[PDB]
From Swiss-Prot, chain A:
Pfam families from the UniProt entry: Cep3 (PF16846), Zn_clus (PF00172)
The UniProt record lists the keyword Phosphoprotein: yes
Additional note from the record: Present with 1900 molecules/cell in log phase SD medium.
Cited PANTHER family: CENTROMERE DNA-BINDING PROTEIN COMPLEX CBF3 SUBUNIT B (PTHR31001:SF90), UNCHARACTERIZED TRANSCRIPTIONAL REGULATORY PROTEIN (PTHR31001)
Organism: Saccharomyces cerevisiae (strain ATCC 204508 / S288c) (Baker's yeast)
Gene of this entry: CEP3
Domain of life from the UniProt record: Eukaryota
BP-aspect Gene Ontology terms: kinetochore assembly; mitotic spindle assembly checkpoint signaling; septin ring assembly
Gene3D superfamilies, A to Z: Zn(2)-C6 fungal-type DNA-binding domain (4.10.240.10)
Cellular component terms per the entry's GO annotation: CBF3 complex; kinetochore
This protein's name: Centromere DNA-binding protein complex CBF3 subunit B
Major localisation: nucleus
Coiled coil: none
From Swiss-Prot, chain B:
PANTHER family: SKP1
Organism: Saccharomyces cerevisiae (strain ATCC 204508 / S288c) (Baker's yeast)
Gene Ontology terms: biological process: cellular response to methylmercury; exit from mitosis; G1/S transition of mitotic cell cycle; G2/M transition of mitotic cell cycle; kinetochore assembly; mitochondrial fusion; mitotic cell cycle; mitotic intra-S DNA damage checkpoint signaling
Principal location listed in the UniProt entry: cytoplasm
Subunit and interaction comment: Component of the E3 ubiquitin ligase complexes SCF with HRT1, some cullins like CDC53, and some F-box proteins like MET30 CDC4 and SAF1. Interacts with CDC53 and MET30 to form the E3 ubiquitin ligase complex SCF(Met30) which also contains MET4. Forms complex SCF(Cdc4) together with CDC4 and CDC53. Component of the CBF3 complex, which is formed of CBF3A/CBF2, CBF3B/CEP3, CBF3C/CTF13 and CBF3D. Component of the RAVE complex composed of RAV1, RAV2 and SKP1/CBF3D. Interacts with RCY1, ROY1, CBF3D and SGT1.
Transport among keywords: no
Protein's recorded name: Suppressor of kinetochore protein 1
Chain positions found as Phosphothreonine: T136
GO molecular function, one term: cullin family protein binding
Pathway: Protein modification; protein ubiquitination
Spans annotated as Interaction with the F-box domain of F-box proteins: 94-151
Subcellular location as annotated: Cytoplasm; Nucleus; Chromosome, Centromere, Kinetochore
């Protein structure tokens, strides 16, 4: 993080912001969300614990509660399922059928595919339902009678997450009853694109990467090289190709949002680049976000003309997002406009962060603070309109993680009063994100607290130099925070454990570094 | 021991094994008395091929992947005093060496055809002008009219 | 004054071979979804019987048979089996426990795949001395007098493969990727498991590609700064990688889009000629087959410089397989000799077939007949003692399919006297192949019978000239077989039947064509 006595020069800051463009990836992208440190000698797995578990969680949800869940999804979630399953009014028939042939003894594979699709839809309903509507529909007491936890808790203190995860596991178990590897079909892709609108790709990242590899395998199985409605074909096949276009957009979106080192097989490589009509808007914004965030792990800094072309396209899509009309009584269009405006604000914030880091253009920190205040004014606004479930979509965890980590990292080194007020606003917002995120929210609070204590360590310890190289304990601690997680995401040790009997055989500066790493360890954000 | 090269007419030619492993096809065929059919080769042509291998048992040939040692190698004295035969039976020797994958017989037995295509008289290049068609008669008239002035 | 249609009919054979004998016969599984069952009570009481049917000493006799007679198959994947006797010991120790770690269940799945390979490659005389016929028939409820050689060893092989898959599915192997999945599939791929389930094997192979590329290892050369355990780990990983490319190319088609094999052995590419020729010799002889079978579906002639280069590498690998060690005191050396000699005979036959079709070089028909006799001489030679099971490897089924289909196709149109005796010899050989191939052998016999009846139809109807192109019922039947199997290998119809309520909607010669397609249908080779 740098490129003997003390000094006061500022050669540390330009190489240090380029070091932020590596730290952001390996901590807030890969280490916090996409790293699940597993152990195979300690993990239990069978088919006696989970079978009766899925029996209980399917016998728990009664018939008429499911239709209230589907009515909530139809009225209040229109910007999520339309990318995957189109119209949910076509899916009421499948819920009626599943509550007809539930009593049968022999289920067909097509029937269990429709059951897995509607249970993934039920998982999306549970994840986005407010606690007021969720306490009216479901009861709490049989879940405590079966699981055996402390019976005093409500839904909001860590119980809606457990029912969401168990409904996602029931959807996956009904996929596993299909032997879906032996019968590839589009309901697998639709069910995973419903499940990926929740925190399923962060509670089980390796399982979601294998599900996404199966979805890429099942989608490329059909061999559609053009998603345009041609005049010569059957008008049923043209509707099918429109459906595969709008599923392919969401599928490359979820392909980008899991772009870790634990997901090596890509779908988005077969798409061009920019360098109905509202789902393609999310596609353009996510593709622009990909064209920005591909410069994290690589070392080649982007050109000025590239960022300027991204800026012109960003202004065009800002005009497109600001022109989407919406009815305040129709909650689906409000959530639609929230998703579009929040994604375009996230792309704007990342663009001006890359301006601040890679070139330090004059009057660019003001734009970073401006779009951070735009993100805050979007998220805090949802508490004042009784649409509190808008802040549960997984982009407001990713975006707030990037923003609070960058503002903490900038308040460590370069002090400013506006940045300090912005950091206080970020901390107050991070404390008030919804409880459905669960462990990831508490680990974000831990990471912000660790970068706050690192500012105290930067203040009470004086910077050194070596003429061209600068030494400081904060620099070495931020080196080792990347090195620990690059050691954790090194799958060579699982390979050595898998190949058999091969067992792996492996001043105050160092004192302060080891005491700070013992006190605030970076491996507390792992799971 | 010994192998049998069954010709295309039906005769049997008992050849020593180390001599008959000059043929790459037979040396790969031996990896199973070991007879083997050679369908498109007459008895006399296969006799000439076996006499070639009987002489060149002990000789050392280039590495079959050369630019200099394979193109610019002169033919042997025996190979030039060996192929003074009928022209059609010479091409049948070359066909036999291209079937049996005998590369140095396809080397020295085919530089002779190269020495016969070049080194020929320029009168009978003018005589053999369109023995295969290769030109419209309008273009033949134009070509013969372009060099009409000399002869 | 000859047969002038013949070049543009052999150019049609280059397409008929791919859409019948490659894709239509081995890699097509026409499944409906409103008829296929899906349950976890049928298999959980069936695989329990197939895991209780094996005993301890029977399993150690299977492992002794693997150690003595199958070293050309597992040693690339799992290494030497003397490290795996401990795993069979630990499986029979941990049989009665009720909490299984995933690191135990992967070794259980790997040794059940090894047991599947042992059952598939065992002669019936050694099989009857180990197992018992009668408890299996008292369980399954079938024809009682149905001894192992009469079509029962295939049933126990398929059920051991399915039990190895059930123990993989108890691992939650999508949520815990490890190299033992790749090893278990590379053991199962030496059986007819990639042809009994050609859509399950493609998805397991996609999971093995995702499991391999999870490690992010591109250079298998052990670097100077490596752990001395990690060096042997990367060497074993390189052997697994080239075994995986070998078993990955053989399942290429329209139902398997995600391919691992990206390199070239002649003339970008990533990963080749960095590795020592030990058992990448099995890969190098298949990439030299990939450079020939990439022009089946392609509609351009291969350049003759490429065919001459392939001929030169054929001669080099002839002298390399004759440079192998003569360990006659181990019976697996002759089987490795048979594999690496039968592959080079197969690639030689395909090379001179493409010389005969595309260019008609010097005596190429006689070279096709010669290498067909070499393939026959390699398979008939194995009908002796101690090596009868060598004709069970799936490459001889693939190669005999290609060769007898080309000779039956060529006997129709060219009245020859050596091709006729060759076809009688291959008919006698196909009626003498091992019966463990099952239904694929009967479908190959049916395809040869159909081409013979089509020869009888060729002599019957007089050929109709039209000046520019010809017309015959045989030509239209051969045109229509590809169109029927392309209609069967198009998953768009299952997509229209899958997206919801969408419904799929779209003389002298025609009578003979429809009578021949009604009497000898091409849809019999699918099942
Ligand atoms: N005299 C001719 N034009 N012969 C060529 C006929 C065309 C045919 N398709 C070939 O064979
Ligand atoms: N394939 C041959 C004959 C043919 C013509 C037209 C249709 C079908 C077959 C030529 O052309
Ligand atoms: N193959 C050939 O060149 C001979 C036949 C060709 N139709 C001429 O005449
Ligand atoms: C076959 C090809 N259509 C001709 O003949
Ligand atoms: N391709 C062609 O049309 C050639 C034609 N079959 C003749 O004979
Ligand atoms: C080559 C083929 O198409 C041609 N009509 C002759 O023979
Ligand atoms: C030209 C005709 O005789 C045939 N197509 C040859 O070539």
């Amino acid at each position: 993080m740098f490129n003997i006595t003390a000094s006061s020069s500022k050669e540390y800051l330009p190489d240090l912001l380029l070091f932020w463009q590596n730290y952001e990836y390996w901590i807030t992208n890969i280490g916090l969300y996409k790293t699940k440190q597993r152990d195979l000698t300690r993990t239990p797995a069978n088919l006696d614990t989970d079978t009766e578990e899925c029996m209980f969680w399917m016998n728990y949800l009664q018939k008429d509660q499911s239709f209230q869940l589907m009515n909530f999804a139809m009225e209040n979630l229109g910007a999520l399922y339309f990318g995957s399953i189109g119209d949910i009014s076509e899916l009421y028939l499948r819920v009626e059928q599943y509550w007809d042939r539930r009593a049968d003894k022999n289920h067909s594979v097509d029937g269990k595919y429709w059951d897995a699709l509607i249970w993934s839809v039920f998982t999306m309903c549970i994840y986005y339902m407010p606690v007021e509507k969720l306490a009216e529909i479901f009861s709490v007491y049989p879940l405590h009678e079966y699981l055996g936890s402390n019976k005093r808790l409500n839904w909001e203190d860590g119980m809606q997450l457990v029912m969401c995860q168990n409904f996602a596991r029931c959807s996956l178990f009904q996929l596993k009853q299909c032997d879906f590897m032996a019968h590839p079909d589009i309901r697998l892709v639709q069910a995973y694109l419903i499940l990926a609108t929740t925190t399923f790709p962060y509670d089980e990242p390796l399982l979601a990467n294998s599900l996404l590899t199966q979805c890429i395998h099942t989608f490329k199985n059909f061999h559609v090289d053009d998603f345009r409605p041609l005049l010569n074909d059957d008008p049923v096949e043209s509707i099918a190709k429109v459906t595969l276009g709008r599923i392919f957009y969401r599928l490359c979106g979820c392909d980008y949002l899991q772009s870790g080192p634990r997901k090596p097989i890509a779908l988005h490589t077969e798409v061009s680049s920019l360098l109905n009509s509202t789902e393609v808007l999310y596609w353009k914004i996510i593709s622009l976000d990909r064209d920005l965030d591909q410069y994290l792990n690589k070392s080649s800094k982007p050109p000025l003309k590239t960022l300027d072309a991204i800026r012109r396209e960003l202004d065009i899509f800002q005009y497109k997002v600001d022109s989407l009309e919406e009815d305040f009584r129709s909650n689906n269009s409000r959530f639609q406009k929230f998703i579009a405006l929040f994604q375009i604000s996230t792309v704007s914030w990342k663009l001006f962060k890359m301006y601040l880091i890679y070139y330090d253009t004059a009057d660019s920190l003001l734009k970073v603070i401006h779009y951070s205040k735009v993100i805050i004014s979007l998220i805090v606004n949802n508490f004042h309109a009784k649409s509190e479930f808008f802040n549960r979509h997984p982009m407001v965890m990713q975006t707030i993680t990037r923003v609070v980590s960058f503002i903490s990292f900038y308040q460590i080194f370069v002090e400013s009063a506006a940045v300090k007020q912005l950091l206080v606003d970020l901390t107050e917002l991070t404390a008030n994100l919804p409880t459905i995120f669960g462990s990831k929210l508490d680990k974000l609070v831990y990471l912000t607290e660790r970068l706050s204590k690192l500012k105290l360590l930067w203040d009470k310890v004086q910077l050194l130099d070596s003429g061209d190289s600068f030494y400081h304990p904060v620099f070495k601690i931020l080196q080792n925070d990347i090195k620990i997680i690059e050691l954790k995401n090194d799958e060579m040790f699982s390979l050595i454990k898998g190949l058999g009997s091969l067992v792996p055989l492996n001043s105050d500066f160092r004192t302060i570094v080891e005491e700070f790493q013992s006190e605030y360890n970076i491996s507390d954000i792992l799971s | 021991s010994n192998v049998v090269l069954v010709s295309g007419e039906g005769e049997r030619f008992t050849v020593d094994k180390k001599i008959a492993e000059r043929s790459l096809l037979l040396k790969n065929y031996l990896n199973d008395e070991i007879v083997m059919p050679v369908p498109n080769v007459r008895s006399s042509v296969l006799q000439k091929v076996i006499e070639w291998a009987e002489h060149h048992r002990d000789s050392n040939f280039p590495d079959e992947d050369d630019d200099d040692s394979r193109k610019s190698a002169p033919v042997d004295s025996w190979d030039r005093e060996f192929l003074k035969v009928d022209q059609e039976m010479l091409y049948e020797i070359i066909l036999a060496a291209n079937y049996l994958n005998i590369k140095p017989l396809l080397d020295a037995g085919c530089k002779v055809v190269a020495e016969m295509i070049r080194g020929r008289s320029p009168e009978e290049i003018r005589r053999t002008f369109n023995i295969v068609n290769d030109f419209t008669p309008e273009e033949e008239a134009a070509i013969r009219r372009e060099n009409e002035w000399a002869e």
